[PDB]
Curated annotation (Swiss-Prot):
Residue(s) carrying Phosphothreonine: 68
Localization in the cell: Cytoplasm, Sarcoplasm
Quaternary context: Monomeric.
Residue ranges of domain Globin in the record: 2-148
Official protein name in the record: Myoglobin
Residue positions binding O2: 65
Annotated positions binding nitrite: 65
GO molecular function terms attached to this record: heme binding; metal ion binding; nitrite reductase activity; oxygen binding; oxygen carrier activity; peroxidase activity
Organism: Physeter macrocephalus (Sperm whale)
Family according to the record: Belongs to the globin family.
Function: Monomeric heme protein which primary function is to store oxygen and facilitate its diffusion within muscle tissues. Reversibly binds oxygen through a pentacoordinated heme iron and enables its timely and efficient release as needed during periods of heightened demand. Depending on the oxidative conditions of tissues and cells, and in addition to its ability to bind oxygen, it also has a nitrite reductase activity whereby it regulates the production of bioactive nitric oxide.
Length: 154
């Protein structure tokens, strides 16, 4: 699948507002994921002891990881589909070390769309959401293909 230039522009336009507060978006997305799908929290030995949203919001450690997550995803998006090099080490560690099924990549994709919809309604209308969903579907499809090459079904 291939996105048009118009679709990439919708994606990068809303991402530019995300980059105004990377740590805050990183927090909201991870907390959203953990509250909506609590089984994902079990993949993080670092975090699985956090019992409540209040404890999550206070964790400087979780906030740091949100920044790492959003910075990696941002670098991928800015490649506008030319992301094979960024994707190799990410697929390797999430297949082999962390063992993250594609289903969980779908769950965090929903958290991203939900947070952007909440914080940026003016820049995340139907067309912009469609473009963002397409970009994330492309990310997941390419990561799934690498998973298969590396020997993990996901
Ligand atoms: C857009 C989706 C995601 C991106 C861009 C991303 C990115 C990253 C990056 C850059 C790291 C640090 C380096 C590395 O180990 O590769 C990391 C670590 C990690 N990721 Fe992800 N990740 C994503 C989704 C997920 C999901 C959905 C889960 C689990 C449900 C997960 C589980 C983990 C774990 C357990 C670690 C190790 C954390 C630690 O102990 O420090 N990742 N991720």
């Amino acid at each position: 699948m291939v996105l048009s230039e118009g679709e990439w522009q919708l994606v990068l336009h809303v991402w530019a507002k995300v980059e105004a507060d990377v740590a805050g978006h990183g927090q909201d997305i991870l907390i959203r994921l953990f509250k909506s799908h609590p089984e994902t929290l079990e993949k993080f030995d670092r975090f699985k002891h956090l019992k409540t949203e209040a404890e999550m919001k206070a964790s400087e450690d979780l906030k740091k990881h949100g920044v790492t997550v959003l910075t990696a995803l941002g670098a991928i998006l800015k490649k506008k589909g030319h992301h094979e090099a960024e994707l190799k080490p990410l697929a390797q560690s999430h297949a082999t070390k962390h063992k993250i099924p594609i289903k969980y990549l779908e769950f965090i994709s929903e958290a991203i769309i939900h947070v952007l919809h909440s914080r940026h309604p003016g820049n995340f209308g139907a067309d912009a959401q469609g473009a963002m969903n397409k970009a994330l579907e492309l990310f997941r499809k390419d990561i799934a293909a690498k998973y298969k090459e590396l020997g993990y079904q996901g």
